[PDB]
Amino acid sequence: AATPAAVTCQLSNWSEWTDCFPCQDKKYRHRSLLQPNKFGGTICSGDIWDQASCSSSTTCVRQAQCGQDFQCKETGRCLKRHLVCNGDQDCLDGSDEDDCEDVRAIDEDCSQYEPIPGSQKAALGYNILTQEDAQSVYDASYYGGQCETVYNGEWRELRYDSTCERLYYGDDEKYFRKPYNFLKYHFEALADTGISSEFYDNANDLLSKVKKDKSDSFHSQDTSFLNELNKYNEKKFIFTRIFTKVQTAHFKMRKDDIMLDEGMLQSLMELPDQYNYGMYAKFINDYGTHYITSGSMGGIYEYILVIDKAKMESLGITSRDITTCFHCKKFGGGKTERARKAMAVEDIISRVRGGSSGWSGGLAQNRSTITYRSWGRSLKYNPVVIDFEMQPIHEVLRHTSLGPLEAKRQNLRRALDQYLMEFNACRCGPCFNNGVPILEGTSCRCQCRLGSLGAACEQTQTEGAKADGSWSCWSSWSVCRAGIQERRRECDNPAPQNGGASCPGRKVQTQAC
Amino acid sequence: GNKRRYSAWAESVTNLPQVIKQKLTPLYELVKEVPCASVKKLYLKWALEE
Amino acid sequence: VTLMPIDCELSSWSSWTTCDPCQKKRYRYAYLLQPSQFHGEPCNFSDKEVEDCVTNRPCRSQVRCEGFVCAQTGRCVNRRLLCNGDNDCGDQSDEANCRRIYKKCQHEMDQYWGIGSLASGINLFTNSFEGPVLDHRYYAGGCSPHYILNTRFRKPYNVESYTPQTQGKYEFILKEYESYSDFERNVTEKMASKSGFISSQSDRGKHYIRRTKRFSHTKSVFLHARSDLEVAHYKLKPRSLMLHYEFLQRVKRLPLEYSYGEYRDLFRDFGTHYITEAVLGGIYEYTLVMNKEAMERGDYTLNNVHACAKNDFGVSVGKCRGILNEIKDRNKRDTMVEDLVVLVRGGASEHITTLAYQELPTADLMQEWGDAVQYNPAIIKVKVEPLYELVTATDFAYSSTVRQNMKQALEEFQKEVSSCHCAPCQGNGVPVLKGSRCDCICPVGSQGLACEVSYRKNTPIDGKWNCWSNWSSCSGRRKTRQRQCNNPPPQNGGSPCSGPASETLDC
Structure with missing residues (x-):
C-alpha cells in the first residue's frame, strides 16, 4: 500500500474547572485526546491537562x-x-x-554502609503503554530506622601497596544497607546460555534431451529435430539464535506497610475522593500504570542471524534442421529461451542489556571470549534489571501505611481502565512491514525496522515480505440493556499481509452490564 | 595436570586439609554428662545396630 | 489461530471465618482455579480479603518474657546480653543506658560468606529463596575463634557449623561418530549389425547407458562436561533457633482460625521450608550436541538407436534413422543441527560470563571461577525442614494450633502452586506457574509465547503429567495420574513420564 494520508491531532474542549481545592488553592481541568497525529499531521499545541491558581475562601x-x-x-x-x-x-x-x-x-551507627547501588530503579513506577519508568512509587531511601544489610558477594577488588609487596583485596563494598521497601534483596551469580544453529540446503537439477534424425532418398531429404531442457534449483537456509542471561541479584518488594515516596504521597493526598478523570489520569501519567514487585538484576545478550538464499535457472531449446536435393537446398528453424534469478537476504540482530557502553557495544559487535569476559566484568559495576513482575498502580494503595483508601483506589482503577483505553497505541495508524506503533504524549510514530521505511514503514525496499497483521483496538462498550456489555475488535490494522500470520488475540470481549 | 597446577594444589591442601584416614569409635562411647547417661548409652548402642 | 489467551480464573470467595478474639479480624479468600496463560488477563491480586471486628473475646497471646524485652522489636533477650557490646536486640535497646560496656570480642570479625542467604527460607516447590526467616546476625555472645585460611569469622548463634569442607569433581565425556556410504553403478550395452551385398546394405545400431551414484554422510558429536565444586559445609542448629523479626511478626499475626489465604501469603512471603544442612559450591555444566548429514543423488540415462538401409541398382533409394536421448537427475541435500546449553552457578559475573561463553574454558578461568566461588557460593545440596517446625511455644502462644494450621495449608499450597494446572506448551516447552499466570519456558531453537515457533520439522515431545486425581475414599486412599497433559508420542515422542501413575496411602 501507499502511505495513509496524514491526520491532524485533535483535542476536546476544556472540561469545567474543578472547584478550588482548599489546601492547594489550585483549579484543575482536562481535555480528551480525540485524535493523535497518526501520520505527518499538525501536532496539538496544548497539553491535555491544565491547572491554575485560586483562592479557596476556606481554610484547611x-x-x-x-x-x-x-x-x-x-x-x-x-x-x-x-x-x-x-x-x-x-x-x-x-x-x-x-x-x-x-x-x-x-x-x-549504620551509615558506614551505602544503600544498595541500583536499588532506585526498583522504586520507580512503570508505564505499560510505553515501557518507560515514571516517577518514584516506593521511597528508595527510607529505612524505617532499621540497619538491615545485604552481603555483596563481589566485594573483592584488587589493591596493591608499593610500601609493602602485597597484592590484596579491599573490602569497602562488602555490605550494603537494604532500604525498607525491599523484603528481599539477594545477590546470587547465575548464568545460562542457549545456542541453536541450523543449516538446510538443497540443490535439485534436471537435464533432458532428445535428438531425432531421419533421412530418406528416392532426390533426397534429411531432417534433424532437437528438444532440450535444463532446470536447476537451489535453496540455502541458515538460522542461529543465541541467548545469554546472567543473574547477579534478585529482589522482592515488601507487600506490607509500604512507605510511598514523598512525591507520590503528596500527589495522592491531592486527589479528590470524588471521581475526576483529569486528576487521576494526571496521577497515572506521572506515577505510571504499574509498579514493580519482583526483580532480577543481571545482564542479557541476544544474537540472531538468519540467511536465506535461492537460485533458479532454466534453459529450453527446440530446433529443426532440414536439407534436400532435387539444385540442393538447406533450411533451419527453431527457438530457445533462457532465464536466471538469484535472491539473498541476511538479517542479524544483536543486543546487550548490561553494564557499560563500551563493552555493551563491543559485545554487540563481536561475540568472543574477550568481549564476553570484559562485559561480564562490567556487569559487576552496573547490572541492569533483566526481569520484573509488576501489578497495577492502584494495588499499591491497599498496602500503604496510610491505611484504607477504598474510594481513591476505585477511582484510580476506573481512571486506569480509561487511561489504558485512551492512550493505547491502537490510535497510531497501521505500521506496515511489522513496524511497531508507538504513542507518546499526543503524537504517534512507527518504529520501522531496517527492511522498511516511510511514515508507516509502508515502503519496504524489496518488493514485499510476509508481514503479520495486528488488531485495531476494541470498539466502545455496547449500550447494554441485558446484563451483558460487549466489545469487538478485528485483525485489520493492518490485516495479515503477503501471507503473514493473523494476530492471535481475542475478537470478542464481554463485561457485566 | 600441569606440574604447577598440582604443586599449587598440594601446597593449598596444607591450609584446607580434609580428613583422609580415620580410626573410629562408636558414638555411644560419648554418651556422657547427662541424666540417665548410662541408660541412654545402652539404648544408643541398641539404636546403632538397628 | 493455534493459540488462544486463557484468562486467569480465581474462585468465588470463601465463607468468612469467625472474628479473631485478639487480631479482631476475619478473613475470606479464593483459590486460583486456572492461571492466565498466553497473555490471558491476570487475576485480581486480592485473592485475599479482610474485614475488621470487635474484640469479642480475649486471647492469651501475651507470651511471658523473663528476659529483657527489646522495646521497639519486642524480642526477648537474656539479661546477660545487656551491655554485651553487640546489638542482640534489633534496636540497641540492650546497649542503651549501660554504665559500662563489656566488649567481648576485641578482635576483628567477619561474617561467614553468604551466611545471610542461608538464613532466608526457601519455597521448596519452586526452589526459590524468599524473605528472611532466621536471624544470622544474633550471636548470643559467641566470640569463640573460628578461622578459614588467615581470616577469622564470628559464627552466628543459629549456625552449628560452617566449615570449609573443600572438594571438587569433574566429568568429561565426548562421543564422536561418523559413517558414510557410497554406491556407484554403471551399465553399458552396445549392439551393431550389418549386411552387405544390384546392391543392398542394411545396418542396425543400439547403445544403452545407465549410471547411478548415491552417497550419504552422517556425523554426530556429543560433548558433555560438568564440574561440581564444594567449598563449605553448613549445618543449622536443631533447637532454640532465633527467628527473624519480619518472620516473627508475620507469624504472630497469623489467625488462630484456619483461613488458608493467610498461610498462603506466609508461604508466598517466606516460602515453605528452611535449610538445616546445605553444601555450598559452584556448578558448571556444558552440553553440546551436533548432527550433520549430507546426501548426494545422481541418475543418468542415455540411449542411441540407429536403423539405416541403402538399396542400389545407376540409381539408389534409402531410408536411414537415428535417435539420441539423454537424461540427468541430480540432487544434493545438506543439513546441520546444533544445540549448546551452558549452566553456571556460583562465582563472579566476569567468570560466570566467560564460562557462559560457548567455548570450553581455559583452566585459568576455571581456577579463577573456583576461587571466586568461595566468596559467593551457590547451594548444591540442601536438606530442609518445613517452616512450621519454627512455630514454637517459646515464641508464640497457641503454637500448636498455628503449627497444625500451617501443616494443612502446606498441603493446600503444594496442590495450588503445582504447574500441572497449566496448559501444555508446544515444542516441548515447560510451563512454569509464575504468580497467577503461566510462562512457557521454551528450549532455544523453539520460540514464542507457547514455543509455537520452531524451524525444526520434528522435535521429540517428552511426557507431562496431568494433576493427580483427588483423594479416594478410605480402605486404601488413592490418587491417579495419566501422562495426559502432554502425551509423549508426538514428533518422535520422548520418554514417558515417571511414575507413580497411581499412588496409594493410609486413610
Missing part, C-alpha cells in the same frame, strides 16, 4: 491531622515517633532531626 487543617504520629511540615510523611531524632532524616524537611539535642535518641 490537614497539617495537624496525623499529629499523633510525627507529621512533617513539608510532606504528609507521618512517622512512628522513635524515628524522631533517630539520627537519620526520614522526611526531606529533616524536621524529625532538627533540634535533636537529646541525641541519645539515635538508633544505630
Whole structure:
C-alpha cells in the first residue's frame, strides 16, 4: 500500500474547572485526546491537562491531622515517633532531626554502609503503554530506622601497596544497607546460555534431451529435430539464535506497610475522593500504570542471524534442421529461451542489556571470549534489571501505611481502565512491514525496522515480505440493556499481509452490564 | 595436570586439609554428662545396630 | 489461530471465618482455579480479603518474657546480653543506658560468606529463596575463634557449623561418530549389425547407458562436561533457633482460625521450608550436541538407436534413422543441527560470563571461577525442614494450633502452586506457574509465547503429567495420574513420564 494520508491531532474542549481545592488553592481541568497525529499531521499545541491558581475562601487543617504520629511540615510523611531524632532524616524537611539535642535518641551507627547501588530503579513506577519508568512509587531511601544489610558477594577488588609487596583485596563494598521497601534483596551469580544453529540446503537439477534424425532418398531429404531442457534449483537456509542471561541479584518488594515516596504521597493526598478523570489520569501519567514487585538484576545478550538464499535457472531449446536435393537446398528453424534469478537476504540482530557502553557495544559487535569476559566484568559495576513482575498502580494503595483508601483506589482503577483505553497505541495508524506503533504524549510514530521505511514503514525496499497483521483496538462498550456489555475488535490494522500470520488475540470481549 | 597446577594444589591442601584416614569409635562411647547417661548409652548402642 | 489467551480464573470467595478474639479480624479468600496463560488477563491480586471486628473475646497471646524485652522489636533477650557490646536486640535497646560496656570480642570479625542467604527460607516447590526467616546476625555472645585460611569469622548463634569442607569433581565425556556410504553403478550395452551385398546394405545400431551414484554422510558429536565444586559445609542448629523479626511478626499475626489465604501469603512471603544442612559450591555444566548429514543423488540415462538401409541398382533409394536421448537427475541435500546449553552457578559475573561463553574454558578461568566461588557460593545440596517446625511455644502462644494450621495449608499450597494446572506448551516447552499466570519456558531453537515457533520439522515431545486425581475414599486412599497433559508420542515422542501413575496411602 501507499502511505495513509496524514491526520491532524485533535483535542476536546476544556472540561469545567474543578472547584478550588482548599489546601492547594489550585483549579484543575482536562481535555480528551480525540485524535493523535497518526501520520505527518499538525501536532496539538496544548497539553491535555491544565491547572491554575485560586483562592479557596476556606481554610484547611490537614497539617495537624496525623499529629499523633510525627507529621512533617513539608510532606504528609507521618512517622512512628522513635524515628524522631533517630539520627537519620526520614522526611526531606529533616524536621524529625532538627533540634535533636537529646541525641541519645539515635538508633544505630549504620551509615558506614551505602544503600544498595541500583536499588532506585526498583522504586520507580512503570508505564505499560510505553515501557518507560515514571516517577518514584516506593521511597528508595527510607529505612524505617532499621540497619538491615545485604552481603555483596563481589566485594573483592584488587589493591596493591608499593610500601609493602602485597597484592590484596579491599573490602569497602562488602555490605550494603537494604532500604525498607525491599523484603528481599539477594545477590546470587547465575548464568545460562542457549545456542541453536541450523543449516538446510538443497540443490535439485534436471537435464533432458532428445535428438531425432531421419533421412530418406528416392532426390533426397534429411531432417534433424532437437528438444532440450535444463532446470536447476537451489535453496540455502541458515538460522542461529543465541541467548545469554546472567543473574547477579534478585529482589522482592515488601507487600506490607509500604512507605510511598514523598512525591507520590503528596500527589495522592491531592486527589479528590470524588471521581475526576483529569486528576487521576494526571496521577497515572506521572506515577505510571504499574509498579514493580519482583526483580532480577543481571545482564542479557541476544544474537540472531538468519540467511536465506535461492537460485533458479532454466534453459529450453527446440530446433529443426532440414536439407534436400532435387539444385540442393538447406533450411533451419527453431527457438530457445533462457532465464536466471538469484535472491539473498541476511538479517542479524544483536543486543546487550548490561553494564557499560563500551563493552555493551563491543559485545554487540563481536561475540568472543574477550568481549564476553570484559562485559561480564562490567556487569559487576552496573547490572541492569533483566526481569520484573509488576501489578497495577492502584494495588499499591491497599498496602500503604496510610491505611484504607477504598474510594481513591476505585477511582484510580476506573481512571486506569480509561487511561489504558485512551492512550493505547491502537490510535497510531497501521505500521506496515511489522513496524511497531508507538504513542507518546499526543503524537504517534512507527518504529520501522531496517527492511522498511516511510511514515508507516509502508515502503519496504524489496518488493514485499510476509508481514503479520495486528488488531485495531476494541470498539466502545455496547449500550447494554441485558446484563451483558460487549466489545469487538478485528485483525485489520493492518490485516495479515503477503501471507503473514493473523494476530492471535481475542475478537470478542464481554463485561457485566 | 600441569606440574604447577598440582604443586599449587598440594601446597593449598596444607591450609584446607580434609580428613583422609580415620580410626573410629562408636558414638555411644560419648554418651556422657547427662541424666540417665548410662541408660541412654545402652539404648544408643541398641539404636546403632538397628 | 493455534493459540488462544486463557484468562486467569480465581474462585468465588470463601465463607468468612469467625472474628479473631485478639487480631479482631476475619478473613475470606479464593483459590486460583486456572492461571492466565498466553497473555490471558491476570487475576485480581486480592485473592485475599479482610474485614475488621470487635474484640469479642480475649486471647492469651501475651507470651511471658523473663528476659529483657527489646522495646521497639519486642524480642526477648537474656539479661546477660545487656551491655554485651553487640546489638542482640534489633534496636540497641540492650546497649542503651549501660554504665559500662563489656566488649567481648576485641578482635576483628567477619561474617561467614553468604551466611545471610542461608538464613532466608526457601519455597521448596519452586526452589526459590524468599524473605528472611532466621536471624544470622544474633550471636548470643559467641566470640569463640573460628578461622578459614588467615581470616577469622564470628559464627552466628543459629549456625552449628560452617566449615570449609573443600572438594571438587569433574566429568568429561565426548562421543564422536561418523559413517558414510557410497554406491556407484554403471551399465553399458552396445549392439551393431550389418549386411552387405544390384546392391543392398542394411545396418542396425543400439547403445544403452545407465549410471547411478548415491552417497550419504552422517556425523554426530556429543560433548558433555560438568564440574561440581564444594567449598563449605553448613549445618543449622536443631533447637532454640532465633527467628527473624519480619518472620516473627508475620507469624504472630497469623489467625488462630484456619483461613488458608493467610498461610498462603506466609508461604508466598517466606516460602515453605528452611535449610538445616546445605553444601555450598559452584556448578558448571556444558552440553553440546551436533548432527550433520549430507546426501548426494545422481541418475543418468542415455540411449542411441540407429536403423539405416541403402538399396542400389545407376540409381539408389534409402531410408536411414537415428535417435539420441539423454537424461540427468541430480540432487544434493545438506543439513546441520546444533544445540549448546551452558549452566553456571556460583562465582563472579566476569567468570560466570566467560564460562557462559560457548567455548570450553581455559583452566585459568576455571581456577579463577573456583576461587571466586568461595566468596559467593551457590547451594548444591540442601536438606530442609518445613517452616512450621519454627512455630514454637517459646515464641508464640497457641503454637500448636498455628503449627497444625500451617501443616494443612502446606498441603493446600503444594496442590495450588503445582504447574500441572497449566496448559501444555508446544515444542516441548515447560510451563512454569509464575504468580497467577503461566510462562512457557521454551528450549532455544523453539520460540514464542507457547514455543509455537520452531524451524525444526520434528522435535521429540517428552511426557507431562496431568494433576493427580483427588483423594479416594478410605480402605486404601488413592490418587491417579495419566501422562495426559502432554502425551509423549508426538514428533518422535520422548520418554514417558515417571511414575507413580497411581499412588496409594493410609486413610
